[PDB]
Amino acid sequence: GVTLFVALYDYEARTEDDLSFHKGEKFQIVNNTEGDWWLAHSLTTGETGYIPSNYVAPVD
């Protein structure tokens, strides 16, 4: 299977390159090898964009 990630806190993006999200929202990771911001797909909005890795945690 896969490991999803969960938002720990709300976040309001400043650029449309980044997702805005709310605590508890779940994401599939598209790419998390290029840096501290991860390209992700929200299972709530269906949008794809960057998320800050310090705002999420893996499902556990």
């Binding site: 806190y9 709300d10 976040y11 390159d17 790419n31 290029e34 840096g35 501290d36 911001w37 991860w38 390209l39 960057y50 800050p52 890795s53 310090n54 705002y55």
Partner: peptide
């Protein structure tokens, strides 16, 4: 710096 490598936001 590319989008992946920007500074992270502070924790809330």
């Amino acid at each position: 710096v590319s989008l992946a490598r920007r500074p992270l936001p502070p924790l809330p």
